[PDB]
Amino acid sequence: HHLRKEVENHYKLSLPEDFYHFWKFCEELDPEKPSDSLSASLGLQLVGPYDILAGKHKTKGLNFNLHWRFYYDPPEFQTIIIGDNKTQYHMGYFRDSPDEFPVYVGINEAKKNCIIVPNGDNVFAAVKLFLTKKLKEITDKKKINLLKNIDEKLTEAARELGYSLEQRTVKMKQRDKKVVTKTFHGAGLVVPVDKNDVGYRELPETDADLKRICKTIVEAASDEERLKAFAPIQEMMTFVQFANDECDYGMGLELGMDLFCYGSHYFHKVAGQLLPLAYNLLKRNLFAEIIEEHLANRSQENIDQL
């Protein structure tokens, strides 16, 4: 238990039991360098909070809210595993609230899109599902044999700890019932809703209509034309203020989250007025910290250890 606290103090988040157990699993694969134990076979490397566990942090300004934070990582998403750097595939724990344990493991290809796909509810499941998928493309007998052997240890190890290997578990199907909207990335927002439906209201535009509005902004041929194109966003931002006054905090969270996900720097400012505020009102103060620092420093190269 004693090496738990060095990881979690740096990130200001609690990590689930599968995070620590999986380290011991990877340690067993390679006692000398546990993090790259899956690197040759699967192209995966344990990173993020695993870098601290790996002792990679004792070389060093070091800001862990940005450490292995990819371009489209919302504050809910804390990277723990990286894959193909061509698609910039990586995996992260997803938390609806910094005060809860992660609700599942998500994956994104930051060079492809902003969508976060559920990939099991623990780090053991997420890699097993990937391994099964990688074996379908492999035509080489030694690599196939190596992956087949390791699969038995994961399955047996998962069985031994009582961890599900399903892509969507029961708590995941239960959390999906609480999802008040998907947003552009598809992973969903969870906010508290009381007995009068207070906490969320829908946007005045469909997701398709919002995406359309943004394109006209980003493709505007002059700043004079962009300012005019902003009018529907400015209109929507006034309504979010109304929602905030009446405790429907989730509306500004969804609008801010969708603009971040669209990815254009023209939206960094408005998202910076919506998202910190939205997270603070929800008593998610840490996510407000993360999003300010990410919008101030959102890079396409992001290992603060280089």
């Binding site: 009068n196 005019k228 902003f230 209109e235 006054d245 009102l281």
Partner: protein, 249 residues
């Protein structure tokens, strides 16, 4: 064809609009509403300016407001129609789109239109007011291009308030003899800082905790005031305000 009005009222009319009388002179005479400009040095401006800034709500951080010009409003007939009998006379905020001020100044404040409520109104079909300048100011829909708006200050005969913790579209039926609905918020000006202007209570800021909590969930951040008869409202001042926003992108 030459105008007879003061330049500051002249500038207002140009804003809300578009013979032997100038068209600017002509439109005002068709508002049937006295609008007398006040001096930037006057007691009424110094007090009203202080109301505006001290009740800018903490959660409305995307802009600040500068008071450009202040006008005194006396709507004819509104004084007589006014429920002078009623207590709780407060000077309260009402904000609205630029396109609405001719309607507002010509006919007084009207109740929520008897047309489509959508789902309904937060507290039924009445006239809405706030005690936080910036809560009302957000209803002007000002933008970086259109960064001038108006705020209305009105005497509001609140009388006996029906106090409510949560939303209710049928709030008007529940009045049963009381004279207005007040939605209680976590934050509001407190009576320690109240002041009087020309016989009306001015709920001066800064806002403080009000001690209100909904034991059944979400507690609103700020008060709202709703009257359901236009004779409980008497316009007194009209603020010409420039909204100063942050970096757009």
């Amino acid at each position: 064809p030459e105008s007879q009005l003061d330049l500051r009222v002249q500038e207002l009319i140009k804003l809300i609009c578009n013979s032997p009388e100038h068209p600017l002179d002509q439109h005002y005479r068709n508002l049937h509403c006295a609008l007398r400009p006040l001096d930037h040095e006057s007691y009424e401006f110094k007090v009203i300016s202080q109301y505006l800034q001290s009740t800018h709500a903490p959660t409305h951080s995307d802009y600040t407001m500068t008071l450009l010009d202040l006008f005194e409003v006396e709507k004819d007939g509104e004084k007589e129609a006014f429920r002078e009998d009623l207590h709780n006379r407060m000077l309260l905020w009402h904000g609205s789109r630029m396109s609405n001020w001719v309607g507002i100044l010509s006919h007084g404040l009207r109740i929520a239109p008897p047309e489509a409520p959508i789902t309904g109104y937060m507290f039924g079909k009445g006239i809405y007011f706030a005690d936080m300048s910036s809560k009302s100011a957000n209803y002007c829909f000002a933008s970086r291009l259109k960064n001038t708006g108006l705020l209305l200050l009105s005497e509001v005969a609140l009388g006996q308030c029906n106090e409510l913790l949560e939303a209710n579209p049928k709030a008007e039926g529940l009045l049963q003899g009381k004279h207005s609905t007040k939605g209680l918020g976590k934050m509001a000006p407190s009576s320690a800082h109240f002041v009087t202007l020309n016989g009306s209570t001015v709920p001066l800021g800064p806002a403080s905790d009000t001690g209100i909590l909904n034991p059944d969930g979400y507690t609103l951040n700020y008060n709202e005031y709703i009257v359901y008869n236009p004779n409980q409202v008497r316009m007194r001042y009209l603020l010409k305000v420039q909204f100063n926003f942050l970096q757009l992108w």
